[PDB]
């Protein structure tokens, strides 16, 4: 089997991407944030505290003939941006782009933090990291991908995120028309439960490539590119007037700037992030200070190849017995 679903930016900045997902019988379609940095599939629901719902579409298990309470199971998750959610668990039929999993754990939110409430466009998350990170207790649950894997034509999924445009998540096949040149594969460590890999270096603009190992995670659920302070300083030093602002919470730059590109290494291959991808616009409405899309990972504890990086590539998440990651230009 295979699946193919379009993923769409939630706003003009590509802050996140939503993908329609069918849950239950008859289908209830919710728009979920596919997150390769976490491993819970959770939804706004009929159980979510009413004051914490503001425009989201909810899953109502009582209206699904295939929903079953997973008795005694609870979940609770906290994300890197400080947001959180928690609740109880149902199993139900879940389909993505024509690919169906029966008995998928669907984590129903009883509580969500303010950032989730405030984002009316995101009806929940669909985790695509390794199932070892799943938070369901006392019986840990598998991700949608883990459950689908054995049925897939090939044990892979791909992320093809657009810049200010829709893109695609495919399951079970590699669309050879979706990228240019060849795919370069690189080793993954699953030790922390992430799609963790080591980039071979970077360049700023038309500058020379610096060969240096940068361990980080491929994380579709993180907006920006978070890299070591040394690398980030070298990037922003090439932008007149750019500075790190503790009041704003990172590097800002004059909105009048033209940003240089940023290149990262994948083995001997190179992925180029155009400068425009690094522009996250005015820090506040009408400001001439703009927020940067490359930020320091210092104090996160891990480097994160988030959407800014991933949307510059066609990315293969290879879930074979020994997982690997592939990157191609597009």
UniProtKB/Swiss-Prot annotation:
Disulfide bridge partners, by residue number: 255-290
Alphabetical keyword list: Aspartyl protease, Disulfide bond, Hydrolase, Protease, Signal, Zymogen
Reactions that this protein is recorded to catalyse: Hydrolysis of proteins with specificity similar to that of pepsin A, prefers hydrophobic residues at P1 and P1', but does not cleave 14-Ala-|-Leu-15 in the B chain of insulin or Z-Glu-Tyr. Clots milk
Leading EC class: hydrolase
EC annotation from Swiss-Prot or TrEMBL: 3.4.23.22
Domain of life: Eukaryota
This protein's record includes keyword Protease: yes
Protein's UniProt name: Endothiapepsin
């Amino acid at each position: 089997s295979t699946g193919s679903a379009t993923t769409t930016p939630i706003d003009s900045l590509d802050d996140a991407y939503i993908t329609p997902v069918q849950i239950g019988t008859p289908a209830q379609t919710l728009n979920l944030d596919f997150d390769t940095g976490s491993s819970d599939l959770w939804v706004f629901s009929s159980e979510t505290t009413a004051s914490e719902v503001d425009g989201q579409t909810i899953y109502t298990p009582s209206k699904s003939t295939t929903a079953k309470l997973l008795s005694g199971a609870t979940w609770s998750i906290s994300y890197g941006d400080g947001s959180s959610s928690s609740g109880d668990v149902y199993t139900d039929t879940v389909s993505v782009g024509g690919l169906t999993v029966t008995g998928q754990a669907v984590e129903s939110a009883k509580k969500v933090s303010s950032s989730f409430t405030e984002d009316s466009t995101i009806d929940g998350l669909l985790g695509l990291a390794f199932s070892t990170l799943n938070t369901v207790s006392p019986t840990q649950q598998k991700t949608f991908f883990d459950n689908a894997k054995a049925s897939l034509d090939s044990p892979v999924f791909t992320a093809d995120l657009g810049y200010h445009a829709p893109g695609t998540y495919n399951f079970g096949f590699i669309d050879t028309t979706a990228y240019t040149g060849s795919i370069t594969y690189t080793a993954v460590s699953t030790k922390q439960g992430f799609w963790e890999w080591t980039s071979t270096g970077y360049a700023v603009g038309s500058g020379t490539f610096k060969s240096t190992s940068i361990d980080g995670i491929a994380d579709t659920g993180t907006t920006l590119l978070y890299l070591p302070a040394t690398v980030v300083s070298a990037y922003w030093a090439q932008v007149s007037g750019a500075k790190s602002s503790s009041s704003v919470g990172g590097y800002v730059f004059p909105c009048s700037a033209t940003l240089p590109s940023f290149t990262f290494g994948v083995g001997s291959a190179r992925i180029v992030i155009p400068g425009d991808y690094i522009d996250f616009g005015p820090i506040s409405t009408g400001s001439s200070s703009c927020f940067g899309g490359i930020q320091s990972s210092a104090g996160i504890g891990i480097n994160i190849f988030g959407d800014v990086a991933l949307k510059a590539a066609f990315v293969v998440f290879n879930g074979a017995t020994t997982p690997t990651l592939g990157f191609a230009s597009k």
